[PDB]
Design an enzyme around this catalytic site. Structure first.
Site, PDB file in Angstrom:
ATOM      1  N   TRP A 102       0.821  -1.223   0.000  1.00  0.00           N
ATOM      2  CA  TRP A 102       0.000   0.000   0.000  1.00  0.00           C
ATOM      3  C   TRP A 102       0.851   1.269   0.000  1.00  0.00           C
ATOM      4  O   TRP A 102       0.432   2.273  -0.564  1.00  0.00           O
ATOM      5  CB  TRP A 102      -0.964  -0.086   1.178  1.00  0.00           C
ATOM      6  CG  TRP A 102      -2.068  -1.068   0.858  1.00  0.00           C
ATOM      7  CD1 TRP A 102      -2.360  -2.234   1.486  1.00  0.00           C
ATOM      8  CD2 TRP A 102      -3.019  -0.935  -0.210  1.00  0.00           C
ATOM      9  NE1 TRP A 102      -3.447  -2.840   0.886  1.00  0.00           N
ATOM     10  CE2 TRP A 102      -3.861  -2.061  -0.157  1.00  0.00           C
ATOM     11  CE3 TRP A 102      -3.235   0.031  -1.204  1.00  0.00           C
ATOM     12  CZ2 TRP A 102      -4.912  -2.248  -1.062  1.00  0.00           C
ATOM     13  CZ3 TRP A 102      -4.282  -0.152  -2.109  1.00  0.00           C
ATOM     14  CH2 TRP A 102      -5.103  -1.278  -2.034  1.00  0.00           C
ATOM     15  N   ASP A 172      -1.581   6.592   6.229  1.00  0.00           N
ATOM     16  CA  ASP A 172      -2.651   5.721   5.761  1.00  0.00           C
ATOM     17  C   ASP A 172      -2.914   4.653   6.818  1.00  0.00           C
ATOM     18  O   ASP A 172      -2.150   3.713   6.923  1.00  0.00           O
ATOM     19  CB  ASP A 172      -2.211   5.054   4.459  1.00  0.00           C
ATOM     20  CG  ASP A 172      -3.225   4.068   3.910  1.00  0.00           C
ATOM     21  OD1 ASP A 172      -4.295   3.862   4.522  1.00  0.00           O
ATOM     22  OD2 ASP A 172      -2.949   3.508   2.826  1.00  0.00           O
ATOM     23  N   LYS A 196     -12.287  -1.431   6.270  1.00  0.00           N
ATOM     24  CA  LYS A 196     -11.370  -2.429   6.779  1.00  0.00           C
ATOM     25  C   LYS A 196     -11.691  -2.571   8.263  1.00  0.00           C
ATOM     26  O   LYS A 196     -12.227  -3.525   8.799  1.00  0.00           O
ATOM     27  CB  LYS A 196      -9.937  -2.000   6.588  1.00  0.00           C
ATOM     28  CG  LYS A 196      -9.154  -2.561   5.430  1.00  0.00           C
ATOM     29  CD  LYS A 196      -9.725  -2.085   4.121  1.00  0.00           C
ATOM     30  CE  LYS A 196      -9.056  -2.842   2.985  1.00  0.00           C
ATOM     31  NZ  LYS A 196      -7.839  -2.181   2.459  1.00  0.00           N
TER      32      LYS A 196
HETATM   33  C1  LIG Z   1      -7.492  -1.420   1.341  1.00  0.00           C
HETATM   34  C2  LIG Z   1      -6.426  -0.353   1.598  1.00  0.00           C
HETATM   35  C3  LIG Z   1      -6.296   0.744   0.772  1.00  0.00           C
HETATM   36  C4  LIG Z   1      -7.227   0.921  -0.435  1.00  0.00           C
HETATM   37  O1  LIG Z   1      -8.524   1.311   0.003  1.00  0.00           O
HETATM   38  P1  LIG Z   1      -9.715   1.580  -1.021  1.00  0.00           P
HETATM   39  O2  LIG Z   1     -10.832   2.136  -0.184  1.00  0.00           O
HETATM   40  O3  LIG Z   1     -10.028   0.216  -1.600  1.00  0.00           O
HETATM   41  O4  LIG Z   1      -9.190   2.527  -2.041  1.00  0.00           O
HETATM   42  C5  LIG Z   1      -5.385   1.718   1.033  1.00  0.00           C
HETATM   43  N1  LIG Z   1      -4.478   1.498   2.036  1.00  0.00           N
HETATM   44  C6  LIG Z   1      -4.537   0.380   2.813  1.00  0.00           C
HETATM   45  C7  LIG Z   1      -3.516   0.270   3.944  1.00  0.00           C
HETATM   46  C8  LIG Z   1      -5.482  -0.577   2.587  1.00  0.00           C
HETATM   47  O5  LIG Z   1      -5.591  -1.667   3.393  1.00  0.00           O
END
Ligand SMILES: *Cc1c(COP(=O)(O)O)cnc(C)c1O
Ligand SMILES: *Cc1c(COP(=O)(O)O)cnc(C)c1O
Lengths: 361, 361
Positions: A102, A172, A196
């Site tokens: 990511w 993130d 998530k």
């Molecule tokens: C799943 C995830 C993303 C992507 O998220 P989306 O909402 O699908 O764009 C970004 N960063 C991390 C750490 C992720 O687990």
């Protein structure tokens, strides 16, 4: 009515109580004769939910001040673009800590916007050993430093964050936000796709230091300026109102669970059971990152062969497990154990893992 | 009953049958032991819903070929930027038909991206008289011609669309998509936030002619390229999975209501009842737009004064109506009567209009 042992990585488990609550008022919210989905985003009923969600999230974090909670569509992936669009100026560098899949996606978008700098990287270790904080070094012209708190695909997680002085730190936290206490004041911006670790899909939570976004770049699309969200309280256009309503419900549940300290304790217990199953497996199960880099949200592990891993997945599906196959770019297995995954799912997984080891090893 | 007489303009009514269906399987979808909200967007269960929604949409439109249904987050407002970002190249001009508030928003966004041209405008009538199609004048360098099929705030709606030849025709159909048959082949791209006539907020439906988006501009952020969505079937990142599930349910309901011809006839009957109440009120109620521009989705009208309108709206709320005050930029009243607003709501409205009038003027 039996619940699956859901180890999906995103979208993912929600608290059964939250699903039951939302189901019961899905048609008629508080005797208004409408679903929350059918109400105006500028009406007082929805606005109360929209504003309450922000207040409850700040309260879970200890009520830091000077931060605004934004609700933005487009997933964390859209934030990969929106962050450098808003903060990377010519003559500056967007600095990234490169910890895996990511982080790599995030750097990719920044390279489309401007100059970038890798501030630290665990690539040489195949992303199994997180960079120590001492290894993070910013270029002088850094606009920001971006890290990924939990690398969802590799199964690695930072336990602590660097102090970047006058450079804004951006995280993130899609796969671990509100799994653990942290000091928001270390960050200028934290973001997470909600699906998530909170569970609802279609909403991204962006928590931003107000002083960083007072005036967004004027050449940008309206919807890609942070001040559009700040100045309009995320209501410039129609928000993802059902998703935000569901975030509100999940935040209530986190509070009921003892807040961030409570969910942290519960998740450490869950993770500890499964890592112990890997670490006491006779080499039959092996982890995919270094012990000191282990995530408490996404536990990744491997068997001796891809053929065995396929066999494990298939057998696990027959016993009610969902989502244990590792992401396809990395293979292996991945047990995602976000806040709402119950300890009983983890006990069942360890039992299954013991059976499969005994019969196949 | 107990359902509110919901005339909200966006988010707006959903069919009660859709809400009941979704509620009933909200906690456990099809004995999977998960809600649809807890499942992987790359799992076969969700993928089936995601793909079914596209197929049902195309079938409602008569199965036109060579078009892809995309699900994009960010609302129609994000499409105001994404459209010129993808199609407006140097030396080209984005042409707009300027019919009111939402056309104006769309044009403002395009100007941030590149050169624009007003190909027709109803500004001189204060947007109360749609431009005739023969008034549209493109220049040779037109990247596309964008129009707004239904001007949600003004209450104006096109009945027919121009033939633009090799210039792609693009329609913002946010407030009337799937309210009526139309020939998709007239268009290069149509889009709509789902929350007026397709389901809940948080998904935007974009239906695009495949040949127009084969190669998106490569300098764009990944999430702002149409080919990201085409190549990945709107699953490049996590989609708004619950919103798409709900759109699928609404599409099922539209078919059960007789498809686009059936909802068109129903909506004309709703709209005719309310236009008659206005017209027949001896001036107490006054329709805003010229008769040939009348929308069947958003009926806008005035009383003698705004104070009186305020009184009307406040009186309507104790009778179970919601949403009737017109947008603040235009004042007046607005009855939004999208597909799911039942005739019974409209009958209640006309009766209320008569009772309100009777005590007054
Ligand atoms: C799943 C995830 C993303 C992507 O998220 P989306 O909402 O699908 O764009 C970004 N960063 C991390 C750490 C992720 O687990
Ligand atoms: C509501 C509306 C929009 C804005 O949609 P969002 O999803 O809120 O961005 C755009 N165009 C028309 C015609 C609308 O009615």
């Amino acid at each position: 009515s039996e619940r699956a042992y859901n180890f999906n990585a995103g979208p993912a488990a929600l608290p059964l109580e939250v699903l039951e609550r939302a189901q019961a008022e899905f048609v008629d919210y508080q005797h208004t004769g409408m679903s929350i989905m059918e109400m105006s985003h500028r009406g007082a009923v929805y606005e109360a939910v929209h504003n309450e969600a922000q207040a409850r999230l700040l309260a879970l974090l200890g009520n830091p001040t000077g931060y605004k909670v934004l609700f933005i569509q487009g997933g964390a992936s859209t934030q990969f673009a929106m962050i450098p669009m808003n903060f990377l100026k010519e003559g500056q560098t967007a600095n990234y800590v490169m910890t895996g899949s990511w982080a790599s996606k995030a750097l990719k978008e920044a390279k489309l916007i401007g100059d970038t700098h890798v501030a630290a990287s665990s690539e040489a270790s195949n992303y199994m050993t997180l960079p120590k904080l001492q290894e993070i070094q910013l270029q002088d012209n850094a606009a920001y430093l971006h890290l990924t708190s939990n690398e969802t695909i590799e199964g690695a997680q930072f336990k602590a964050f660097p102090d970047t002085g006058s450079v804004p730190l951006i995280g993130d936290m899609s796969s671990d936000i509100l799994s653990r206490p942290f000091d928001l004041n270390q960050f200028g911006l934290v973001y997470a796709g909600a699906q998530k670790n909170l569970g609802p899909s279609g909403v991204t939570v962006v928590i931003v230091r107000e002083d960083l976004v007072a005036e967004s770049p004027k050449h940008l699309p309206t919807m890609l300026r942070y001040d559009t969200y700040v100045k309009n309280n995320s209501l410039y256009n129609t928000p993802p109102s059902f998703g935000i309503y569901m975030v509100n419900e999940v935040l209530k549940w986190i509070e009921e669970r003892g807040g961030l300290e409570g969910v942290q304790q519960a998740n450490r217990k869950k993770a500890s059971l499964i890592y112990d199953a890997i670490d006491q497996s006779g080499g039959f199960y092996r982890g995919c990152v270094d012990v000191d880099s282990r995530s408490d949200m996404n536990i990744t592990f491997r068997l001796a062969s891809e053929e065995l891993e396929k066999e494990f997945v298939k057998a696990s599906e027959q016993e009610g497990f969902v989502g244990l196959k590792g992401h396809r770019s990395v293979g292996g297995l991945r047990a995602s154990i976000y806040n709402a995954v119950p300890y009983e799912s983890c006990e069942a997984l360890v039992q299954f893992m013991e059976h499969f080891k005994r019969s196949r090893g």
